Amino acid sequence: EPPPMESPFQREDRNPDRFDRDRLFSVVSRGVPEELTGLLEYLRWNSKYLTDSAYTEGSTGKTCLMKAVLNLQDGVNACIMPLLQIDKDSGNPKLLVNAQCTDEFYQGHSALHIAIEKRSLQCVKLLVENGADVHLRACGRFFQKHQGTCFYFGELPLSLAACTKQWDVVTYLLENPHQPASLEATDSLGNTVLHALVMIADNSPENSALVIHMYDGLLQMGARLCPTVQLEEISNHQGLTPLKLAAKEGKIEIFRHILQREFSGPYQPLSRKFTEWCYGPVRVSLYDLSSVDSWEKNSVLEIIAFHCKSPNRHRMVVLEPLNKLLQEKWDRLVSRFFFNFACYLVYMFIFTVVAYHQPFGESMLLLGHILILLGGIYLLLGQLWYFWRRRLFIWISFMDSYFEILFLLQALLTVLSQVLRFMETEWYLPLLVLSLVLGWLNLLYYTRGFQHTGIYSVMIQKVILRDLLRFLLVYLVFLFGFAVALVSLSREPYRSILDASLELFKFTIGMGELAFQEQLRFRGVVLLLLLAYVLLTYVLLLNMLIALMSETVNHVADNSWSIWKLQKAISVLEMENGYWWCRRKKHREGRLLKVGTRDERWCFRVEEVNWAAWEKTLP
Amino acid sequence: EPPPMESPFQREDRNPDRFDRDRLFSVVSRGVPEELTGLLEYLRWNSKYLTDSAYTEGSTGKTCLMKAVLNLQDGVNACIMPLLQIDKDSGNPKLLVNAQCTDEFYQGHSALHIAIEKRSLQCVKLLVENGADVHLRACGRFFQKHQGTCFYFGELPLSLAACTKQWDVVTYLLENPHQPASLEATDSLGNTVLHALVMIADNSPENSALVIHMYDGLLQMGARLCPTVQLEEISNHQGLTPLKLAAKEGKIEIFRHILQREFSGPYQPLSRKFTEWCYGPVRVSLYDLSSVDSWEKNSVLEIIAFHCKSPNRHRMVVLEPLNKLLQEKWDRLVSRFFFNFACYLVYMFIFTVVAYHQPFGESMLLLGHILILLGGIYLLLGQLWYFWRRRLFIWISFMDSYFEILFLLQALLTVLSQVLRFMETEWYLPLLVLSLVLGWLNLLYYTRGFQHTGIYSVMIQKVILRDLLRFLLVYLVFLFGFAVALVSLSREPYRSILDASLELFKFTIGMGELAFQEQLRFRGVVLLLLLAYVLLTYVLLLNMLIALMSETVNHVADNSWSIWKLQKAISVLEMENGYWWCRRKKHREGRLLKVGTRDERWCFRVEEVNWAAWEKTLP
Ligand SMILES: CCCCCCCCCC(=O)OC[C@H](COP(=O)([O-])OCCN)OC(=O)CCCCCCCCC
Ligand SMILES: CCCCCCCCCC(=O)OC[C@H](COP(=O)([O-])OCCN)OC(=O)CCCCCCCCC
Ligand SMILES: NCCOB(c1ccccc1)c1ccccc1
Ligand SMILES: NCCOB(c1ccccc1)c1ccccc1
Structure with a gap:
């Protein structure tokens, strides 16, 4: 079992007047600098430094300074300041402020992180002024996001302060002349401070307000500290921007705010929903499609449909501009969807005829057998191409891809049955029959194209x-x-x-x-x-x-409508790639419009009619 | 029918100037000491005392003093004080203050109890100062806990005051120099004052706050009056501490508070949840396993699983540290549980083979018959041993032991069928078949080991x-x-x-x-x-x-998860005893840690991650 961070009861792991390790840890915890005064003499006598392994617990490497900040008294510990001084006079080649744990559980933990967590601005100022690095990565197993014992806040002091909504601490860590913390600073997994707030966010409204307020303030402060840096464009090692990450993690509340962010006044360039004109209950806004339109690879639309696994997927495809963007795509592709449906109906009309009328009539049967073989091969190649593209996330959303498995299974049996007919074995007839049975069941996939039939099917x-x-x-x-x-x-x-x-x-x-x-x-x-x-x-x-x-x-019933919209969303993003034999180009959505000065964006005009909201603002 | 305690309408049971019983009871109820003045002369003339049966009702023995305290006027009765004086001058060998009823209904009822119930501190002080014993046991049928007409408060004046949250009365009864009431004082059933509060507690939150506040204050006051006495270590005649009693009676609210009791300041040694260190939403506490770990006989874990009969059993095994303590045990025993499952699957795979393949092949059948006979005997002995251990509480939790009956029934039929085969009767085949049928149904018991399957089974x-x-x-x-x-x-x-x-x-x-x-x-x-x-x-x-x-x-759905945890709890506490042929030793849980000064306890480190609770304390 990993050792505890701090323990009034359990002692730390063992693995001039004397100032051994135990008496060193005792005085620093009690906060009395008077007894600590002789520590310099003992260190000078032994020609050693406080950072040495002798003055830490071998299981983690927790130093005396980190011990001192774990027993703050009313937000301050009087022993930490003399401790840094004695370390300075000891000639330590490894400064005690920058010391970190070595345990696999608390790896990278530093005294600065403890002061930030303990909400003590006085200790935070005191350590940073003495040279505490503001980019120390606490990359231990305790700080990584996983099931059970964990607390993920990113890995940086700035990210830790943001996750604890310590507005005073983040202000100091950014504006301090001694050692400012860059907003571009990145943890071990590629997450910045903005990414950390996204993936600690819950869908509860108390914590959503915490994340939105922190996300808004940090973004606005970023425009002042680093005006030339677009913080939302930084991606993790997975290649996800903070907007994309919110989609993959399935956190609607932070996702909705970013997708519909509007700022009035000097912070307009940070907005993503530029209102255009209003007339009564009619509102028109220019939503920004940067990293949202499917024209670019790994977009938000693809991530929700094929990469997200949270149960919140259907509730995200109904938010604007995604709701109207998918409707705009669907209206353009509804002609092809019915043509695809018509081709499958013809293919299975022929399948039924050949299956039943089986021993000019012989020539029609001979042609029917050939057409079925080509149709089965065509479906087999198309489904294999689909699984090749989605190879990275198979079985992640089997509730939605189960129809794509059935189409492949019916295609395999169709081809195999024709192969067995070539071998003239008697067992070809059963496989051809099961192919007919599955395909007629596969016809239920196309019900999603009609609201009249698709909505009812979703409930079942x-x-x-x-x-x-x-x-x-x-x-x-x-x-x-x-x-x-x-x-x-x-x-x-x-x-x-x-x-x-x-x-x-x-x-x-x-x-x-x-x-x-x-x-x-x-x-x-x-x-x-x-x-x-x-x-x-x-x-x-x-x-x-x-x-x-x-x-x-x-x-x-709102869920059934939402899930049907997601089902149409998946179909649109699949048929946008054309066919396996013809990968036609993708049309970019929206129009390029100048929205300010860094500023032209591919804005999408969404018009919003809402009588209830308009009447609320009325006297 | 038992006679009433007090009746303005119904007269009491019949079964110098004259001061007969009726005129004696009339003046004391009206509260006029002026007419009572001649009572000393009549008592002196007859050479009798007020405690005599002539001055009480023969059905109960209710004395005139107890009559006086039943008609208090604005919290005081002016007649009780002269009454004690006249009794003193009468030379009574049995002091009227210590008089008690003799009826089977109100046995042990005294004037002190009436004053405490009537919430009159003035009468309580007046009687005790005159020598009213503070350890009088009201052990009548009215004061015993049973269905219908009852009011259980323990049996002592101190316990009665605690049950009525008379904070002023309990303070006096403990601190009075005339006759202090010991907190160690015990009623007829072994219950102390702390036990009485536990078993009058309901699960309602208005009354839970009453019991918790009274339990906390009395425990804290016990540390001042008797620092050397641990009040929670006193057990009833059943051998139950107040913590154990709360488990048997199935009262979660009082049970949870005791199990997770934490005091900050001078009253720390009374705590049972010593917090260790906190970092963000991560809390680590050293819960105390005294009388909780199953290593000791008649522990809380055994009482909940096998001795409690309330419907609250499943809600108690999810409270910390029981939730983590059982999970710690389950992870150690999950290897044996699957080995037990594997042995039963092999035993029933052989049972199916012999049952079907029944008239080298004959040798395999001969071995199969022998192995079934040994397997049936092994299961028969194991189930008989289980019922021998649980002989004190059979049919109390038949909803949970019904699988243990089926295992025994299948074992009996397995052995009996083989015996009939030895007798070569034709009726052995049916019993062997019903053994096979029951055993395949008994296979559903092992579904509780998997969360994936056990949770679904519980709902049904x-x-x-x-x-x-x-x-x-x-x-x-x-x-x-x-x-x-x-x-x-x-x-x-x-x-x-x-x-x-x-x-x-x-x-x-x-x-x-x-x-x-x-x-x-x-x-x-x-x-x-x-x-x-x-x-x-x-x-x-x-x-x-x-x-x-x-x-x-x-x-x-939370109940189904909770019941599944209880099902695993029962299995763990049964397989901890090893097998009937090998009763392996029990491992003590937790580690011995010094927590203060009387102070070393077998603490169990439970780590608690709670984002919602942590964000509540945040600004
Ligand atoms: C018009 C006469 C057709 C006669 C039958 C020919 C074989 C058709 C086989 C078939 O069922 O194809 C269905 C397919 C659409 O599938 P989907 O997108 O629903 O599948 C996904 C379901 N989840 O439809 C298409 O892809 C379009 C049809 C083929 C166009 C020409 C192909 C030329 C090849 C060189
Ligand atoms: C590996 C080959 C086994 C071949 C069959 C031998 C007879 C097994 C009979 C059987 O079904 O035993 C099941 C038993 C566990 O029962 P439980 O705890 O679920 O029952 C309670 C259910 N509520 O399992 C055990 O107790 C362990 C098996 C016996 C170990 C060796 C015994 C030696 C005896 C001297
Ligand atoms: N072909 C059109 C039938 O559509 B409907 C439909 C039929 C089957 C399954 C789902 C929907 C329908 C809907 C409402 C009332 C009546 C019928
Ligand atoms: N053997 C694994 C089957 O477990 B599951 C299961 C089967 C029978 C009874 C209870 C549970 C299951 C649970 C959810 C979905 C599908 C199956």
């Missing part, structure tokens, strides 16, 4: 289809357990497990032949198993109905 | 399985009633009750042959019974569905 396939596998797994365990019991008991009907499993399943569809069976010597006991099976399978069905019905209470 | 078996027996009891009554009717009507199909019961049941599984039957002379009337049975059995099914569906509204 969300949970119910995934629930049935959970009942079947127990039911099949129950089915095989009773089947062997009946077979082992009827051998002195149910001639084999396969027949016994068949008979037991018939009881579920209301066709069981629950009788004495008139033949078996153990007719009563065999009946007991059938009666027990009937009671057990109805307990399981009632167990299923109650659990499934529980989802009805919490359902909201 | 809570109510639905127990509900079906309630429908079947009426249905079987309906089944036998109609079966005899059809048989008595078809004798001029349904040749016997057994066949008639079989045919009627088929209508429930959607296989009834509801026809005119073409043979019976009373074909129309027999059809009426079948039609009536169909309507009646669907009314019962609709009755069942509506009643069962009503449970969906009030269900909370």
Whole structure:
């Protein structure tokens, strides 16, 4: 187990007048500099420095200075200032202010971070004035974002202060002449201070206000300290800007504010929603499409659809300008979507004809077999190309890509069945039939193109289809357990497990032949198993109905509309790439408009009609 | 019927100037000492005392002094003080202040208790200064905790004052020089004052604040009056400390406060949650495992799992440190749990093989029969050992031990079937089959080891399985009633009750042959019974569905997670004892740490990450 950061009870790890390690740590914690005065003599006598491993705990390397700042008294510790002085006179080649832990848990932890966390501006000023680096990276396992014991604030003192909304500390760390902290400074994972605020943000409104206020103030202060730097353009090692990161992490509240950010006054160039004109309840705004339009790779639209895995994906594609941007794309692509639907209907109309009318008529059948083979190959190549593109995030959103698997599965069976027909084996007919069955089920994918049908479909396939596998797994365990019991008991009907499993399943569809069976010597006991099976399978069905019905209470119809918009969003961003055989170019959305002075942006004109909001401002 | 305590309307039970009993009780109730002045002369004339049975009601022994305190006027009665004086001059060998009732209902009731209940500090001071014992036990049936007419406050004046939050009275009873009341003082059932507050506590928050405030103040005052006494270490006749009693009675609010009690300042040694270090939303506390760890017999963990019967059991195993303590144990024992699961799967894989493949192959069957016999004996001995250990609380938590019954039942049938095979009777095959059926159903017990499967299972078996027996009891009554009717009507199909019961049941599984039957002379009337049975059995099914569906509204998913944690808690505390053939030693949890001065405790380090709570304290 990793050692604790500070412990009044547990002692630190062991692994002129004497000033050994234990008595050194005792005086610094109590905050009495009077007893510390002889430390310089002992250090001079031994020709050693406070940064030496002898004056720290070997498990972490926690120095005496870091010990001192962990027991602040009313926001200050009188022992830390003499401690730095004695270190200065000791001739330390490694200054105590810049000392860091070495443990895998608290790696990079420094005395400056402790002072920032303890909300003591006095210690923060005192350490920085003495040369405490403001770019020390606390890159330990405790500070990394993961399940369980963690506190991610970035890795920098400036980012830690921002995450604790210490407005006084961030002001000093930026404006101090001794050692200013750059806003461009970057942690080990590529996250800046703005990125850190994004990925600590929750969807709760108390913490969303914290992040939005910190994000707004730091962005506005960045315009003063570094006017030539656009802080939102810095990307992590994953290549994500703070806007893109908010999309991937699925944090709507911070995502919405950045996407619709508007500043009035001198800070206008930092805005992303430039209002254009208003007439009554009609508002027109020029939303900025920088890093939002799908024309550029790794955009926000692609990240939400294919890279985000949070349950908040459907609620993000309805925010402006994404709602209107996707609608603008959908109206341009709805003609192609129906053409794709028409081609699949023709392909499966031919599939049905060949499957049924199978042994000029022979020539039509010969052509039908050939067209099916080409159609199956075409679908197989298209689906393989889709999975090749989405190879980095397979099985991450299987609830949405399950139709793309079915199209591939039907394509594989279509091609394989034709191959078996070439081999003239009798087993080609089944595979051709299962291809026909799956494809007619795959026709339900295109219902998303119609609001009239797509909205209704969304309410259904969300949970119910995934629930049935959970009942079947127990039911099949129950089915095989009773089947062997009946077979082992009827051998002195149910001639084999396969027949016994068949008979037991018939009881579920209301066709069981629950009788004495008139033949078996153990007719009563065999009946007991059938009666027990009937009671057990109805307990399981009632167990299923109650659990499934529980989802009805919490359902909201707005979610079904939102999910349908996400389904159209995924389809648009896939068919924008054209086809596998023809990767047509992508049209850039919006128009280039000058919005200020650094300032031209690819703005997208969104018009907003809202009677309720307009009447609220009215007297 | 027990007589009333006080009655303005009903007279008390009958069973110098004259001062008979009736005129004595009249003056004391009215509170006029002027008419009482001659009482000394009458007592002197008769050479009698007020404590004599003549001056009380024979049904209870309620004395005149207890009569006086039952009619206090504005918190005081002017007659009680002269009453004690006249008793003093009467030469009473049994002082009136210490007089108690003799009725089985109000046994031990004294005048001091009445003054405490009536919230009169003036009478409380007046009686105690005259020698009223502060350790009088009111051990009547009225003061014992039971259904109906009762008021349990312990049995002592100090405990009564604590239960009525009379802060002024408890202060006096503890600090009075005349007769201080010991906090160690114990009632008839072993309960001290701290125990009394625990078992009058409700889970409501108005009364929880009452108990917590009284528990905290009395514990803190105990450190001043008796610093050398640890009041929480006193146990009842059942052997339960106040912490253990709160667990058995299932009162979370008082249980949580004691389990996580933290005091800052001089009262630190009374704490049980010693905070260690804090960094942002990360809090680390040293919870005390005294009487909590399962290493010691009759611990809190065992009491909640096996001794508590309240519905609050699942909500207690999620409180810290119990939540982390059980998780620490579970991670150490999850390797053994799967090994136990693997052994049962192998045992039932062999059971299935022998059951099916039954008349080198013969040698394998011979070995399989032998291995099943040893496996059945092993399970039989293990389950008997489990019930021997839990013999004191069988059928108290049958909802949790019902799987342990099924394992025993399957073990008994496994052994008995092999015994019958030795006898070479034909009836061994059925019992071996029912053993196979039950064991495959017993495999559902091990689903609790996986969160992925255990959580889903908990939602189902809570109510639905127990509900079906309630429908079947009426249905079987309906089944036998109609079966005899059809048989008595078809004798001029349904040749016997057994066949008639079989045919009627088929209508429930959607296989009834509801026809005119073409043979019976009373074909129309027999059809009426079948039609009536169909309507009646669907009314019962609709009755069942509506009643069962009503449970969906009030269900909370947090309960299912909590119950699963309790299920793992029971399994851990059972497999900690090793096996019946090898009772391996128990590992003590936590580490011994010095926390103060009486002070070393077996503290358990629990680390708490809570962003929402941390942000609440932030500006
Ligand atoms: C008009 C007559 C058509 C006769 C049948 C020919 C084979 C069609 C096979 C087929 O079903 O293609 C469907 C496809 C769209 O699939 P999707 O985007 O829904 O799939 C994704 C679902 N998630 O549609 C297309 O890609 C367009 C059709 C092919 C155009 C010409 C191809 C030339 C190749 C060199
Ligand atoms: C590995 C090969 C095993 C072949 C079959 C041998 C008989 C096993 C019988 C069996 O099912 O035992 C299950 C048992 C655990 O039961 P539980 O704790 O779930 O039951 C409680 C459920 N509520 O498991 C155990 O206790 C461990 C298995 C026995 C170890 C060696 C025993 C030696 C005896 C001298
Ligand atoms: N082909 C048009 C049918 O669309 B509807 C539809 C049909 C099947 C599944 C989902 C929707 C419909 C919607 C509302 C009322 C009636 C029908
Ligand atoms: N063997 C793993 C199956 O677990 B799951 C499961 C199966 C039966 C009963 C309870 C749980 C499951 C849970 C959620 C979705 C799908 C399946």
